[PDB]
Amino acid sequence: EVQRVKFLNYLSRNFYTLRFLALFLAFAINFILLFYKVSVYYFLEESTGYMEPALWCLSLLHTLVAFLCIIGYNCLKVPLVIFKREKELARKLEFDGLYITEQPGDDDVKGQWDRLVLNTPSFPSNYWDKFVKRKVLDKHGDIFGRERIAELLGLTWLMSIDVKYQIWKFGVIFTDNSFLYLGWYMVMSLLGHYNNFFFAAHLLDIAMGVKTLRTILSSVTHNGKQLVMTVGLLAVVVYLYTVVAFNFFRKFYNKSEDEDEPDMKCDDMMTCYLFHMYVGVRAGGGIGDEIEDPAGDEYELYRVVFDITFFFFVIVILLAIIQGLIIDAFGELRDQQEQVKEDMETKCFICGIGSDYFDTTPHGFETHTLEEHNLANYMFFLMYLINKDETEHTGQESYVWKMYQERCWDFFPAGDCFRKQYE
Amino acid sequence: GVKTLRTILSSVTHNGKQLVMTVGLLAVVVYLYTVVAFNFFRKFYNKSEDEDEPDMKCDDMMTCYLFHMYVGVRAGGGIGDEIEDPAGDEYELYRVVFDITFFFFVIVILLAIIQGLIIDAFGELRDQQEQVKEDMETKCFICGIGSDYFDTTPHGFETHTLEEHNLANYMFFLMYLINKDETEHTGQESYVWKMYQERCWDFFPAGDCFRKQYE
Amino acid sequence: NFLELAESILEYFRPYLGRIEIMGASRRIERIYFEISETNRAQWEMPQVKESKRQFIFDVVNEGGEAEKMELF
Amino acid sequence: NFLELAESILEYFRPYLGRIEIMGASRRIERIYFEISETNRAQWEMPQVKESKRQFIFDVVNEGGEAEKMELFVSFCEDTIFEMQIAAQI
Ligand SMILES: [Zn+2]
Ligand SMILES: [Zn+2]
């Protein structure tokens, strides 16, 4: 029984390798899978005859690894996620105190689930501060019904676990825009047994697998809110063209092969509109390419304008505004990774003072990082503090701890550095 | 050979890693489309010329996936252009959705992400050949003091280049120090040689120039 | 001089003595010197954590860069 | 005045007298005045060397631009010295 709390840690220990190991398998299996043929779903079994059974363990092996990762993920990031959501709350009750005063409101129920958990006895399990809930009543509740606030607060090992903390955490884990993916990932692996064809979808992990591709989606995705609506602009505009073609040019909309045959002539609107959404947006050469050319009809001169306008206003502009919005999009991230590095190399980060004051001594600004701050050093310091017993502090160490609890955070330097002070 | 082309091709190659991985992303997605096509629409995948002939019908998956990587990526007009148009089939609608989704997610997006990754690339090189000239005209190079302190005298920063430092000058000076015998040094010369051997390189000016010193 | 003689002490503890700066009670800048746990100097310098900081700096410089900067940090 | 009468000397040696600046022993800024071989003054201003310098400045400004700057710079000067020695072979 005890090893479960060891192998679990073994599992978490390898988790980044573990997924790359899985995606390695999602290639390995699905690479074999491209050998299928109908006859039925025949397996080609080219060359070696033992190749198909070798795939069978893999379909078991993969879904097992697919299930296997999340359990370490449950012991890795999940507690980090559940952490900050507590801390996002645990301070918020003790400062804004909204449950004591406000309510979050109908949207962002993720913050309104919190109404549940806060009632739970075991709530601040991860913030390393169990007495928050006690600390809060010292505040706020004196202003009104201190125990009116209390109603808001307060082997059997399987029996030992609580309820509301558990139901809540399970959901917060569900709200995650990563756990939900791996949970989505295993499920198709569960579907990888019901058919190996759905097993192919596991390749999508590549999209967030290798780092460069993540950028390549990030090349698009943040603008996707701005982009998708262009497709909304697309369909609507072509819909205006279907309304025009429906009202006029439907003569020309023979689907005839070639002529004098009962082609439907896309005069039902639903297909008439589909006819421009397809083999219309696809055009390349415009809508007119995909319909018989007018010649000498009185409507022709009025028709050929309908094409050119449709060619500019869709395939020349609108595809470009998908082409281009992706370009700017990809062009934007480069501008931000510019400025990010650009600001930390100029302004400090803590002091704010900037890489020019510090030029008075050699590679001075570099020193202003490494020694005067180095960002991280505050981290280790804040680690130093948390580990200390309260008696142990030197006066700064208490003062820092003090402000850290009252959370004003004025003590971190702000333009006064050290070098500017004194001379 | 010619310098301009080196720049043009450089424009691609500095992003080439990212670009090739994008090509990987192309192949994979179109493979996902060859799976979905293999599992459904293979009826339509007649290669028939025109019809009722024993065309192979790319129902061997390798040939089907090759049928999308070729004459799918090549499409222009989409995959649907290169396969007989569905009409009246219950699968027809799902299919036309398939073709549109393929036409956006491949040829409208991905070829545009090759194009735009190239464009951003070219843009990037222009942006860097911008800033390089931009920093040497502002900050000195050796001192770091910047082209603003030196505005107190006419074309002063230019002097701070040509005379106060140049950049070459340190080179010729290092040449001088190399060619001289150790007895031959003046004290600055021995000193510079010394630090040069102990390789700390603090001696090169760092924000103190000469002009800021003194008045 | 005295500092010069102690170098083998200081060379060992520079790796993990800890400077910072704080705007202390004095309303100037006391600087302090916390001890660093030895695991931490490495723990913060290899794994997910190293890139994790980069995810942070992009989260701040690009967004929320007001008083929130120390808050968020 | 004296320099004003000295001008025919200085005009000849400005081309190849050498200023630099160094943060010398004094921990201020001694400046020094090395002589320059004429061949060097010519050598650094025409051939591959110029564009070599450009490649250098691009390499430092765009990348490695911390304390490394002087380092990398001396690496440049040294490489360039080597190159000129090779020119001397020719
Ligand atoms: Zn600072
Ligand atoms: Zn200078």
Helix (H) or strand (E) holding B193: helix B187-198
DSSP state of B60: B
| Length of chain D as a residue count | 90
Residue whose pair of structure tokens reads 């006819």 in the numeric block: A275
**Is D29 touching A (CB cutoff 8 A)?**
no
The verdict on a CB contact (< 8 Å) between D20 and B169 is yes
The 3-state DSSP class for residue B74 equals coil
Sort out which chain A residues have CB atoms less than 8 A from D67's CB and list them. 362-363, 366
Amino acid letter for position D88: A
Most D-contacting residue of A338, A344, A359, A363 (CB-CB within 10 A), to test interface: A363
- Cβ count near D36 (within 10 Å): 21
Give the separation between CA A28 and CA A192, rounded to whole angstroms.
14
Most C-contacting residue of A381, A393, A423 (CB-CB within 10 A), to test interface: A381
Among the listed residues D52, A346, D49, D57, the one whose alpha carbon sits nearest the alpha carbon of residue B131: D57
Tokens of B135: 């920093």
Is the C-alpha dihedral spanning D62, D65, D68, D74 positive or negative? positive
Are the C-beta atoms of D78 and D85 separated by less than 8 Å? no
Give the separation between CA A366 and CA A345, rounded to whole angstroms.
9
Among the listed residues A180, A174, A95, the one whose alpha carbon sits nearest the alpha carbon of residue A136: A95
Are the C-beta atoms of B94 and A197 separated by less than 8 Å? no
**Is B130 touching A (CB cutoff 8 A)?**
no
Q: What angle do CA B135, B139, B144 make, to 5 degrees?
A: 130
Give the separation between CA B174 and CA B169, rounded to whole angstroms.
8
Cα of B164 to ligand 2 centre, how many Å?
A: 6
Question: Rg of chain A over CA atoms, in angstroms?
Answer: 32
**Is B91 touching A (CB cutoff 8 A)?**
no
How far is Cα of residue A14 from the mean position of the Cα atoms in its chain? 22
In the complex, which subunits touch C with 3 or more CB pairs below 8 angstroms?
A
Are the C-beta atoms of B86 and B44 separated by less than 8 Å? yes
Residue whose pair of structure tokens reads 């090349």 in the numeric block: A219
Give the separation between CA A100 and CA A354, rounded to whole angstroms.
42
Give the separation between CA B13 and CA A84, rounded to whole angstroms.
42
Give the β-pairing of D30-35 and C17-22: unpaired
Going by C-beta distance under 8 Å and a sequence separation of 6 or more, which residues neighbour residue B8? B122
Identify any residues that bridge with A43 across adjacent strands, giving them in sequence order.
Answer: A36
Give the separation between CA B177 and CA A341, rounded to whole angstroms.
38
Are the C-beta atoms of A411 and A399 separated by less than 8 Å? yes
Q: Which long-range contacts (CB under 8 A, 24 or more apart) does A327-331 make?
A: A327/B112, A327/B115, A327/B116, A327/B119, A327/B120, A328/A223, A329/A219, A329/A220, A329/A222, A329/A223, A329/A227, A329/B116, A330/A219, A330/A220, A330/B113, A330/B116, A330/B117, A330/B120, A331/B116, A331/B119, A331/B120, A331/B123
CA distances from A212 to B18, B19, C48, C54 (A): 6, 9, 16, 15
**Is D29 touching B (CB cutoff 8 A)?**
yes
CA distances from B10 to A189, A212, B25 (A): 42, 19, 22
The verdict on a CB contact (< 8 Å) between C29 and A414 is no
Please name the member of D19, D22, D62 whose beta carbon is closest to the beta carbon of B205.
Answer: D22
**Is B60 touching A (CB cutoff 8 A)?**
yes
Give the separation between CA B117 and CA A379, rounded to whole angstroms.
38
Q: What angle do CA A346, A351, A355 make, to 5 degrees?
A: 25
Resolution of the solved structure (Å)? 4.2
Residue whose pair of structure tokens reads 């299919």 in the numeric block: B95
Give the separation between CA B125 and CA A331, rounded to whole angstroms.
12
Most B-contacting residue of D10, D13, D14, D20 (CB-CB within 10 A), to test interface: D20
The verdict on a CB contact (< 8 Å) between B173 and D20 is yes
Tokens of A236: 């609507």
Going by C-beta distance under 8 Å and a sequence separation of 6 or more, which residues neighbour residue B50? none
C–B contact (≥3 CB pairs within 8 Å)?
Answer: no
**Is B184 touching D (CB cutoff 8 A)?**
no
**Is B139 touching A (CB cutoff 8 A)?**
no
**Is B4 touching D (CB cutoff 8 A)?**
no
Give the separation between CA B67 and CA A139, rounded to whole angstroms.
70
Residue of chain B with shortest Cα separation from D71: B201
Among all bound ligands, the one having the nearest atom to the CA of B210 is 2
Are the C-beta atoms of A1 and B25 separated by less than 8 Å? no
What's the 3-state SS for chain A?
A: CCCHHHHHHHHHHCHHHHHHHHHHHHHHHHHHHCCEECCCCEECCCCCCCHHHHHHHHHHHHHHHHHHHHHHHCCCHHHHHHHHHHHHHHCCCCCCCCCCCCCCCCCCCCCCCHHHHCCCCCCCCCCCCCCHHHHHHHCCCCCCCCCCCHHHHCCCHHHHCCCHHHHHHHHHHHHCCCHHHHHHHHHHHHHHHHCCCHHHHHHHHHHHHCHHHHHHHHHHHCCHHHHHHHHHHHHHHHHHHHHHHHHCHHHCCCCCCCCCCCCCCCCCHHHHHHHHHCCCCCCCCCHHHHCCCCCCCCCHHHHHHHHHHHHHHHHHCHHHHHHHHHHHHHHHHHHHHHHHHHHHCCCCCCCCCCCCHHHHCCCHHHHHHHCCCCCCHHHHHHHHHHHCCHHHCCHHHHHHHHHHHHCCCCCCCCCCCCCCCCC
Q: Is B199 left (phi over 0), alpha (psi -120 to 50) or beta?
A: left
Tokens of B9: 């091709």
What's the 3-state SS for chain C?
A: CHHHHCHHHHHHHCCCEEEEEECCCCCCCEEEEEECCHHHHHHCCCCHHHHHHHHHHHHHHCCCCCCHHHHHC
Residue of chain D with shortest Cα separation from B211: D29
Give the β-pairing of D30-35 and D17-22: antiparallel
Q: Where are the alpha helices (DSSP H) in B39-167?
A: 61-69, 92-102, 110-136, 156-162
Going by C-beta distance under 8 Å and a sequence separation of 6 or more, which residues neighbour residue A420? A353, A357
Sort out which chain B residues have CB atoms less than 8 A from A324's CB and list them. 116
Q: What angle do CA B77, B81, B83 make, to 5 degrees?
A: 155
Residue whose pair of structure tokens reads 């679990």 in the numeric block: A8
Give the separation between CA B204 and CA B51, rounded to whole angstroms.
81
Are the C-beta atoms of D44 and B171 separated by less than 8 Å? yes
Q: Which long-range contacts (CB under 8 A, 24 or more apart) does B3-9 make?
A: B7/B125, B8/B122
Are the C-beta atoms of B165 and B142 separated by less than 8 Å? yes
**Is A399 touching C (CB cutoff 8 A)?**
yes
Give the separation between CA B199 and CA B193, rounded to whole angstroms.
9
Give the separation between CA C41 and CA D79, rounded to whole angstroms.
38
Amino acid letter for position A111: G
Tokens of B80: 């649907």
Is the C-alpha dihedral spanning B56, B62, B64, B67 positive or negative? negative
Among the listed residues B65, B84, B61, the one whose alpha carbon sits nearest the alpha carbon of residue B26: B65
Q: Give chain B's end-to-end CA distance (angstroms, integer).
A: 52
Going by C-beta distance under 8 Å and a sequence separation of 6 or more, which residues neighbour residue B20? none
Residue whose pair of structure tokens reads 């029996």 in the numeric block: A159
Amino acid letter for position A190: L
Max CA distance (Å), chain B: 99
Which method was used? cryo-EM
Give the separation between CA B28 and CA B202, rounded to whole angstroms.
54
The response to whether C54 counts as a known ligand-binding position is: yes
Give the β-pairing of A42-43 and C17-22: unpaired
| Length of chain A as a residue count | 423
The verdict on a CB contact (< 8 Å) between C29 and A417 is yes
Are the C-beta atoms of A329 and B115 separated by less than 8 Å? no
Give the separation between CA A170 and CA A95, rounded to whole angstroms.
26
Residue whose pair of structure tokens reads 């505050």 in the numeric block: A378
Give the separation between CA A203 and CA A182, rounded to whole angstroms.
13
The response to whether C53 counts as a known ligand-binding position is: yes
The 3-state DSSP class for residue B199 equals coil
Give the separation between CA A414 and CA A28, rounded to whole angstroms.
55
The verdict on a CB contact (< 8 Å) between B145 and A206 is no
What's the 3-state SS for chain D?
A: CHHHHCHHHHHHHCCCEEEEEECCCCCCCEEEEEECCHHHHHHCCCCHHHHHHHHHHHHHHCCCCCCHHHHHHHHHHHHHHHHHHHHHHC
Amino acid letter for position A234: L
Q: Is C64 left (phi over 0), alpha (psi -120 to 50) or beta?
A: left
The 3-state DSSP class for residue B214 equals coil
Backbone φ and ψ of C52, nearest 5°:
-60, -35
Tokens of B212: 């800021």
The verdict on a CB contact (< 8 Å) between A418 and C29 is yes
Task: Report how many helices (DSSP H) and strands (DSSP E) chain B contains, helices first.
Answer: 8, 0
**Is A366 touching D (CB cutoff 8 A)?**
yes
Among all bound ligands, the one having the nearest atom to the CA of A354 is 1
DSSP state of B89: -
Tokens of A38: 């109908």
Q: What is the dihedral of CA B173, B178, B182, B183, to 10 degrees?
A: -50
Give the separation between CA B57 and CA B49, rounded to whole angstroms.
11
- Nearest Cα of chain C lies from the Cα of A383 at a distance, in angstroms, of 8
Cα of D7 to ligand 1 centre, how many Å?
A: 51
Are the C-beta atoms of B100 and B33 separated by less than 8 Å? no
Give the separation between CA D90 and CA D86, rounded to whole angstroms.
7
Interface of C with A in 8-27 (CB under 8 A): 18-25
Are the C-beta atoms of C44 and A380 separated by less than 8 Å? yes
